[PDB]
Design an enzyme around this catalytic site. Structure first.
Site, PDB file in Angstrom:
ATOM      1  N   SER A   1       7.951   7.240   4.702  1.00 39.12           N
ATOM      2  CA  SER A   1       9.076   7.463   5.603  1.00 39.12           C
ATOM      3  C   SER A   1      10.218   6.485   5.342  1.00 39.12           C
ATOM      4  CB  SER A   1       8.630   7.369   7.067  1.00 39.12           C
ATOM      5  OG  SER A   1       8.176   6.068   7.401  1.00 39.12           O
ATOM      6  N   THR A   2      10.462   5.569   6.282  1.00 43.59           N
ATOM      7  CA  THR A   2      11.661   4.739   6.225  1.00 43.59           C
ATOM      8  C   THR A   2      11.375   3.305   5.804  1.00 43.59           C
ATOM      9  OG1 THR A   2      11.483   4.448   8.636  1.00 43.59           O
ATOM     10  CG2 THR A   2      13.034   6.111   7.809  1.00 43.59           C
TER      11      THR A   2
ATOM     12  N   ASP B   1       6.977  15.306  12.222  1.00 38.51           N
ATOM     13  CA  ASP B   1       6.676  15.158  10.798  1.00 38.51           C
ATOM     14  C   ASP B   1       5.168  15.167  10.572  1.00 38.51           C
ATOM     15  OD1 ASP B   1       7.100  14.983   8.106  1.00 38.51           O
ATOM     16  OD2 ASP B   1       7.563  12.845   8.085  1.00 38.51           O
TER      17      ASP B   1
ATOM     18  N   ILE C   1       0.838  -1.234   0.000  1.00 43.07           N
ATOM     19  CA  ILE C   1       0.000   0.000   0.000  1.00 43.07           C
ATOM     20  C   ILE C   1       0.860   1.267   0.000  1.00 43.07           C
ATOM     21  CG2 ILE C   1      -2.045  -1.072   1.058  1.00 43.07           C
ATOM     22  CD1 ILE C   1      -1.258   0.240   3.654  1.00 43.07           C
TER      23      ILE C   1
ATOM     24  N   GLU D   1      -2.836  -1.573  13.559  1.00 42.66           N
ATOM     25  CA  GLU D   1      -4.241  -1.393  13.152  1.00 42.66           C
ATOM     26  C   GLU D   1      -4.286  -1.068  11.669  1.00 42.66           C
ATOM     27  OE1 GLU D   1      -5.375   2.042  15.176  1.00 42.66           O
ATOM     28  OE2 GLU D   1      -6.975   1.134  16.316  1.00 42.66           O
TER      29      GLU D   1
ATOM     30  N   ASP E   1       2.719   7.610  11.224  1.00 43.04           N
ATOM     31  CA  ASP E   1       4.091   7.935  10.749  1.00 43.04           C
ATOM     32  C   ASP E   1       4.999   8.480  11.852  1.00 43.04           C
ATOM     33  OD1 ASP E   1       6.075   7.752   9.016  1.00 43.04           O
ATOM     34  OD2 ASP E   1       5.318   9.193   7.561  1.00 43.04           O
ATOM     35  N   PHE E   2       5.179   7.741  12.943  1.00 43.31           N
ATOM     36  CA  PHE E   2       6.036   8.228  14.051  1.00 43.31           C
ATOM     37  C   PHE E   2       7.522   7.922  13.826  1.00 43.31           C
ATOM     38  CE2 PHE E   2       3.218   9.688  17.516  1.00 43.31           C
ATOM     39  CZ  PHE E   2       2.021   9.522  16.874  1.00 43.31           C
ATOM     40  N   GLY E   3       7.934   7.612  12.601  1.00 43.59           N
ATOM     41  CA  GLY E   3       9.349   7.326  12.314  1.00 43.59           C
ATOM     42  C   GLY E   3      10.293   8.454  12.683  1.00 43.59           C
TER      43      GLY E   3
HETATM   44  N1  LIG Z   1      -4.346   2.346   6.247  1.00 47.67           N
HETATM   45  C1  LIG Z   1      -3.091   2.300   7.031  1.00 47.67           C
HETATM   46  N2  LIG Z   1      -3.097   1.672   8.195  1.00 47.67           N
HETATM   47  C2  LIG Z   1      -2.000   1.603   8.942  1.00 47.67           C
HETATM   48  C3  LIG Z   1      -0.853   2.213   8.439  1.00 47.67           C
HETATM   49  C4  LIG Z   1      -0.870   2.879   7.221  1.00 47.67           C
HETATM   50  N3  LIG Z   1       0.231   3.480   6.695  1.00 47.67           N
HETATM   51  C5  LIG Z   1       0.390   3.761   5.390  1.00 47.67           C
HETATM   52  C6  LIG Z   1       1.653   4.371   5.185  1.00 47.67           C
HETATM   53  C7  LIG Z   1       2.315   4.894   3.874  1.00 47.67           C
HETATM   54  O1  LIG Z   1       3.160   4.279   3.334  1.00 47.67           O
HETATM   55  N4  LIG Z   1       1.883   6.200   3.323  1.00 47.67           N
HETATM   56  C8  LIG Z   1       0.819   7.057   3.954  1.00 47.67           C
HETATM   57  C9  LIG Z   1      -0.244   7.461   2.916  1.00 47.67           C
HETATM   58  C10 LIG Z   1       0.371   8.225   1.816  1.00 47.67           C
HETATM   59  C11 LIG Z   1       1.431   7.446   1.125  1.00 47.67           C
HETATM   60  N5  LIG Z   1       2.152   8.348   0.249  1.00 47.67           N
HETATM   61  C12 LIG Z   1       2.459   6.813   2.091  1.00 47.67           C
HETATM   62  C13 LIG Z   1       2.247   4.450   6.494  1.00 47.67           C
HETATM   63  C14 LIG Z   1       3.528   4.983   6.876  1.00 47.67           C
HETATM   64  C15 LIG Z   1       3.852   4.917   8.244  1.00 47.67           C
HETATM   65  C16 LIG Z   1       2.937   4.348   9.156  1.00 47.67           C
HETATM   66  C17 LIG Z   1       3.231   4.245  10.650  1.00 47.67           C
HETATM   67  C18 LIG Z   1       3.400   4.151  11.822  1.00 47.67           C
HETATM   68  C19 LIG Z   1       3.549   4.102  13.350  1.00 47.67           C
HETATM   69  O2  LIG Z   1       4.637   4.910  13.702  1.00 47.67           O
HETATM   70  C20 LIG Z   1       2.248   4.688  13.958  1.00 47.67           C
HETATM   71  C21 LIG Z   1       2.174   4.554  15.489  1.00 47.67           C
HETATM   72  C22 LIG Z   1       2.490   3.126  15.961  1.00 47.67           C
HETATM   73  C23 LIG Z   1       3.814   2.590  15.365  1.00 47.67           C
HETATM   74  C24 LIG Z   1       3.817   2.672  13.824  1.00 47.67           C
HETATM   75  C25 LIG Z   1       1.696   3.842   8.746  1.00 47.67           C
HETATM   76  C26 LIG Z   1       1.379   3.911   7.359  1.00 47.67           C
HETATM   77  N6  LIG Z   1      -2.010   2.895   6.530  1.00 47.67           N
END
Ligand SMILES: Nc1nccc(-n2cc(C(=O)N3CCC[C@@H](N)C3)c3ccc(C#CC4(O)CCCCC4)cc32)n1
Length: 290
Positions: free
Chosen positions: A32-33, A141, A28, A97, A159-161
């Site tokens: 970030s990292t 961020d 998906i 989640e 996104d807490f990276g």
């Molecule tokens: N639907 C759904 N569900 C769960 C996660 C999720 N998700 C998608 C990501 C992604 O790649 N995105 C975001 C959309 C735009 C696109 N350009 C790039 C993404 C990146 C980081 C994290 C994170 C985290 C934590 O730090 C949060 C606190 C607890 C520890 C982990 C989650 C991400 N998406």
């Protein structure tokens, strides 16, 4: 060394192999990292999301600690819940989640949100930020990509990276970390900064919800990165389309003086957040039917 880092990780992560009970990995994102996938839990049929970050491909390898150390089963109604963390081969895996409404970035690039929904998103962000600042954490961020929704319009932070801990004793940071168009002005100039960076980014995110892009989003990253340093707070290209309540609320967010920025704990009593519609208000903005 790589091996020392892997050893340190193995002391906080949950042991074993998560590929034992996960399958049907669906990619998906690349956020970030690391890359972010979806998998089913065969023992239950439920759905979870999995952040895979390879230690070999990282600018700073020390960033991987915080979200498994700082965000270690920290519960909150408006913060993405992390279930488990595993070290698989050469990558760190975070199971959490599955937020099914996508990110807020999909809404701001395709529709225009009314103040009633902007107030909803902001109420949620500040609700979570309040607790996060009380406990000493900075997100560092906050932007459109960091905000996820459910199918019922509930909004959570992710996104807490890049997050950091401040707590007591040493209470500031001086690390140049985040996304260029969304960071504070005492960021690009290395200065001791506290949680208020978040608030500033929040204001820029408000600008997002009004125009679909951060100030100077048309310029290349450094071309604008330096550009904000000397300048006074930016202002929206569509200020005529925003009511004076939103404008006042935002005017107590994009304050150039970090000591005169508002605090999330004190921003919750603001008038504009009475316009906060129920989470259902956000629902018509998602792709089910725009
Ligand atoms: N639907 C759904 N569900 C769960 C996660 C999720 N998700 C998608 C990501 C992604 O790649 N995105 C975001 C959309 C735009 C696109 N350009 C790039 C993404 C990146 C980081 C994290 C994170 C985290 C934590 O730090 C949060 C606190 C607890 C520890 C982990 C989650 C991400 N998406």
């Amino acid at each position: 060394s790589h091996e020392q880092f892997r050893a340190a990780l193995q002391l906080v992560v949950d042991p074993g192999d998560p590929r034992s009970y996960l399958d049907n990995f669906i990619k998906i994102g690349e956020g970030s990292t690391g890359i972010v996938c979806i998998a089913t839990v065969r023992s239950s049929g439920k759905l979870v999301a999995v952040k895979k970050m390879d230690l070999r491909k990282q600018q700073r390898r020390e960033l991987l600690f915080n979200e498994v150390v700082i965000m270690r089963d920290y519960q909150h109604e408006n913060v993405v819940e992390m279930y488990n963390s595993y070290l698989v081969g050469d990558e760190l895996w975070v199971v959490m989640e599955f937020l099914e409404g996508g990110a807020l970035t999909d809404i701001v690039t395709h529709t225009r949100m009314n103040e009633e929904q902007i107030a909803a998103v902001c109420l949620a962000v500040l609700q979570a930020l309040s607790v996060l600042h009380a406990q000493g954490v900075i997100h560092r961020d906050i932007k459109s990509d960091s905000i996820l929704l459910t199918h019922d319009g509930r909004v959570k932070l992710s996104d807490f990276g890049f997050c950091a801990q401040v707590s007591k004793e040493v209470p500031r940071r001086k690390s140049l970390v985040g996304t260029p168009y969304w960071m504070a002005p005492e960021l690009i100039s290395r200065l001791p900064y506290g949680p208020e960076v978040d608030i500033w980014s929040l204001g820029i995110m408000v600008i997002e919800m009004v125009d679909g892009e951060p100030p100077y989003f048309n310029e290349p990253p450094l071309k604008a990165m330096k550009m904000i340093r000397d300048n006074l707070p930016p202002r929206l290209k569509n200020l005529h389309k925003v009511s004076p309540s939103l404008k006042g609320f935002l005017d107590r967010l994009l304050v150039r003086d970090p000591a005169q920025r508002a605090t999330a704990a004190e921003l919750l009593k603001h008038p504009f957040l009475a316009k906060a519609g129920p989470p259902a208000s956000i629902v018509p903005l998602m792709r089910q039917n725009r």
